[PDB]
C-alpha cells in the first residue's frame, strides 16, 4: 500500500506512486523524474493522467510506450492549474528532466516536494523566494555529516585532465564510462569534447539520450563504436573481466583501457581530496571511482532547509529504519535551533 509520504494532503494527488495499483482517491499521478525506483509500475496500459516535465514525458512515450493522451507535460517556472490546484515545476539539479513540485492548496498551505535533488544557492532565486512554505517533502539520501563531496565542476576537471593526459601519452588507449540510468551525462560528454571524439554507445542508450533535449547532441554521440574512442557500457561491466572482454572486441585498435565509474559517495571521501584519487589497476586496465553526485551533500541540504525555514519536514529517503528516522529528526531540530525558526 502507498506510504503516507507519497500522498499530498488536501488534494487528489500522489508523487512517484506507480507501483501500488490504483491508489484510492488519486485523480492525478505526478512523476518527478525518470529513475526506475520512482517510475516503477508505468507502461503502455496506464490510463490515468500523469503530470511531469517535457523531458520526462519524452521518455514515458518513447521508452515505456505510455500513450500520449495520458501524458501531461508542464513547462518549468510557470504557474499551472491541475484539477483545480495551482502547481509550479522547478529545476531539481538532479538528472535531465527532474523537477521539484510546488503545490498551492486551496486552504492557503504551500507544500514543496523536492523529488530527488542536489540543493544549490541558485534555487534561493527561483519562484521559491516569493512565498512561505509550510511543509517540505525532502530528499534526505545523504542526511548525515559524513557525506561531503566535491563540486561537480571539480570532479569534471579531474576526469578531463586524467583522460586527456592518458590518451596524449598513449593514442591507442580507449576511455570507457559506466552508466545504468539517465544522469551524469557531463562525465562522458566532457571527456569526449577534450579528446575530439563522439561517444559511442548501444542503440538503446542512444535512443534514451535523444529524448533529453541536450543541445548539439547529434554532434556528441553515436552508435558507431569504430569511429569513437570514448565508449559507454553498462555499469555492471566496469570491472576487470568485463573490460578485458570489451578490449578483445575492439580488434587490436586499442591496447589499454582507462575506465570511469561515477559513484555517488564512497568512504574514500572522508579521508581523500579529489586531487588525491587513484585508480585500481590490473595489467593494461585502470578503473577510477569518481564522486560525481546528483544528490545534496549534508551541508548543501542543511543550507537549503535553513534558508527555506519550513514549518514541517517529511523525509522521503532512509525512512525504513527507526535509527535512520531518529538520526534525521535530530539533525532537523539542530538546524531549526541554530537558525532560529
Ligand atoms: Ni533519482
List C-alpha distances in Å: 20 to 109, 116, 206, 259, 321. 27, 20, 31, 39, 21
| 163/194 Cα distance (integer angstroms) | 8
Instruction: Judge contact between 259 and 187, C-beta under 8 A.
Output: no
Query: Which cell numbers in the block locate residue 19?
Result: 507501483
Of the candidates 331, 337, 316, 324, the one whose C-alpha atom is nearest the C-alpha of residue 139 is 316
Tell me how far the alpha carbon of residue 67 lies from the centroid of ligand 1, in angstroms: 23
Query: Which cell numbers in the block locate residue 112?
Result: 514543496
First-to-last CA distance in the chain?
35
Only one residue has cell 545534496, namely: 296
Burial class (CB in 10 A: 0-12, 13-18, 19+), 5: middle
Structural domains in the chain, sorted by start: 1-147+296-341 (3.60.15.10), 148-295 (3.40.50.12650)
Of the candidates 308, 293, 313, 339, the one whose C-alpha atom is nearest the C-alpha of residue 121 is 308
Query: Which cell numbers in the block locate residue 310?
Result: 519550513
Instruction: Judge contact between 109 and 135, C-beta under 8 A.
Output: yes
Tell me how far the alpha carbon of residue 295 lies from the centroid of ligand 1, in angstroms: 8
Tell me how far the alpha carbon of residue 33 lies from the centroid of ligand 1, in angstroms: 7
Of the candidates 116, 138, 106, 143, the one whose C-alpha atom is nearest the C-alpha of residue 37 is 116
Of the candidates 143, 161, 184, 131, the one whose C-alpha atom is nearest the C-alpha of residue 316 is 143
| 237/254 Cα distance (integer angstroms) | 18
Phi–psi pair at 87, nearest 5 degrees? -135, 155
Instruction: Judge contact between 74 and 80, C-beta under 8 A.
Output: yes
Tell me how far the alpha carbon of residue 16 lies from the centroid of ligand 1, in angstroms: 11
| 50/260 Cα distance (integer angstroms) | 35
For the beta sheet containing 71-74, the strands, ordered from the edge strand earlier in sequence to the opposite edge, are: 7-8, 13-15, 28-30, 50-53, 71-74
For the beta sheet containing 110-113, the strands, ordered from the edge strand earlier in sequence to the opposite edge, are: 80-82, 85-91, 99-104, 110-113, 135-138, 312-315
Only one residue has cell 584519487, namely: 277
| 311/235 Cα distance (integer angstroms) | 40
Tell me how far the alpha carbon of residue 292 lies from the centroid of ligand 1, in angstroms: 14
Tell me how far the alpha carbon of residue 221 lies from the centroid of ligand 1, in angstroms: 23
Tell me how far the alpha carbon of residue 182 lies from the centroid of ligand 1, in angstroms: 9
Tell me how far the alpha carbon of residue 94 lies from the centroid of ligand 1, in angstroms: 7
| 12/82 Cα distance (integer angstroms) | 10
Query: Which cell numbers in the block locate residue 296?
Result: 545534496
Show the 3-state SS of 128-190: HHHCCCCEEEECCCCCCCCCCCCCHHHHHHHHHHHHHHHHHHCCCEEEEEEECCCCCHHHHHH
* Contacts of residue 215, Cβ cutoff 8 Å, sequence gap at least 6: none
- Which residues, listed in sequence order, are joined to residue 137 by a DSSP beta bridge? 113, 314
| 112/206 Cα distance (integer angstroms) | 34
Secondary structure of residue 338 in the 3-state scheme: helix
Tell me how far the alpha carbon of residue 116 lies from the centroid of ligand 1, in angstroms: 5
Q: Where are the strands (E) in 194-255, listed by range?
A: 199-200, 221-222, 230-234
- Which residues, listed in sequence order, are joined to residue 199 by a DSSP beta bridge? 221, 230
Tell me how many degrees the CA angle 13-90-116 measures, rounded to the nearest 5: 70
Secondary structure of residue 3 in the 3-state scheme: coil
Tell me how far the alpha carbon of residue 224 lies from the centroid of ligand 1, in angstroms: 29
Tell me how many degrees the CA angle 95-96-97 measures, rounded to the nearest 5: 110
| 271/195 Cα distance (integer angstroms) | 31
Secondary structure of residue 98 in the 3-state scheme: coil
Tell me how far the alpha carbon of residue 318 lies from the centroid of ligand 1, in angstroms: 14
Phi–psi pair at 103, nearest 5 degrees? -115, 130
Of the candidates 90, 112, 95, the one whose C-alpha atom is nearest the C-alpha of residue 39 is 95
Tell me how far the alpha carbon of residue 225 lies from the centroid of ligand 1, in angstroms: 29
Tell me how far the alpha carbon of residue 157 lies from the centroid of ligand 1, in angstroms: 24
| 5/17 Cα distance (integer angstroms) | 10
DSSP letters spanning 10-51: TTTEEES--SSSS-TT-SEEE-----HHHHTT--TT--S-EE
Tell me how far the alpha carbon of residue 96 lies from the centroid of ligand 1, in angstroms: 10
Instruction: Judge contact between 105 and 56, C-beta under 8 A.
Output: no
Q: How many CB atoms lie within 10 A of CB 331?
A: 18
Tell me how far the alpha carbon of residue 167 lies from the centroid of ligand 1, in angstroms: 33
> What's the distance, CA 66 to chain centroid?
22
Tell me how far the alpha carbon of residue 115 lies from the centroid of ligand 1, in angstroms: 8
Instruction: Judge contact between 266 and 294, C-beta under 8 A.
Output: no
Calculate helix-pair angle for 298-308, 322-339, nearest 10 degrees.
Answer: 50
Secondary structure of residue 334 in the 3-state scheme: helix
Length of the chain: 341
Amino acid at each position: 500500500t502507498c506510504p503516507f509520504y507519497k500522498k499530498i494532503p488536501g488534494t487528489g494527488f500522489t508523487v512517484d506512486a506507480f507501483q501500488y495499483g490504483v491508489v484510492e482517491g488519486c485523480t492525478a499521478y505526478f512523476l518527478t523524474h525518470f529513475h526506475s525506483d520512482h517510475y516503477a509500475g508505468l507502461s503502455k496500459h496506464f490510463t490515468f493522467p500523469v503530470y511531469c516535465s517535457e523531458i520526462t514525458g519524452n521518455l514515458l512515450k518513447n521508452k515505456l510506450h505510455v500513450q500520449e493522451q495520458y501524458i501531461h507535460p508542464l513547462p518549468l517556472d510557470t504557474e499551472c492549474i491541475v484539477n483545480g490546484v495551482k502547481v509550479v515545476l522547478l529545476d531539481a539539479n538532479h538528472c535531465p528532466g527532474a523537477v521539484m513540485i510546488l503545490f498551492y492548496l486551496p486552504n492557503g498551505t504551500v507544500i514543496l516536494h523536492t523529488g530527488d535533488f542536489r540543493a544549490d544557492p541558485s534555487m534561493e532565486r527561483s519562484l521559491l523566494a516569493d512565498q512561505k512554505v509550510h511543509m517540505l517533502y525532502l530528499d534526505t539520501t545523504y542526511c548525515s555529516p559524513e557525506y561531503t563531496f566535491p563540486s561537480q565542476q571539480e570532479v569534471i576537471r579531474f576526469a578531463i585532465n586524467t583522460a586527456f593526459e592518458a590518451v596524449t601519452l598513449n593514442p591507442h588507449a580507449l576511455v570507457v564510462c559506466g552508466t545504468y540510468s539517465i544522469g551524469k551525462e557531463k562525465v562522458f560528454l566532457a571527456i569526449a569534447d577534450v579528446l575530439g571524439s563522439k561517444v559511442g554507445m548501444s542503440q538503446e542508450k542512444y535512443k534514451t539520450l535523444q529524448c533529453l533535449n541536450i543541445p548539439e547532441i547529434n554532434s556528441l554521440i553515436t552508435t558507431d563504436m569504430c569511429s569513437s574512442l570514448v565508449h559507454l557500457l553498462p555499469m555492471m561491466q566496469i570491472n576487470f573481466k568485463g573490460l578485458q572482454s570489451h578490449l578483445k572486441k575492439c580488434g587490436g585498435k586499442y591496447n589499454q583501457i582507462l575506465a570511469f565509474r561515477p559513484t555517488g559517495w564512497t568512504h574514500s571521501n572522508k579521508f581523500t581530496r579529489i586531487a588525491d584519487v587513484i585508480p585500481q589497476t590490473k595489467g593494461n586496465i585502470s578503473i577510477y571511482g569518481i564522486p560525481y553526485s546528483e544528490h545534496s551533500s549534508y551541508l548543501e541540504m542543511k543550507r537549503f532547509v535553513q534558508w527555506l525555514k519550513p514549518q514541517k519536514i517529511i523525509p522521503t529517503v532512509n525512512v525504513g529504519t527507526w535509527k535512520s528516522r531518529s538520526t534525521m529528526e535530530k539533525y532537523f531540530r539542530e538546524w531549526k535551533l541554530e537558525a532560529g525558526y
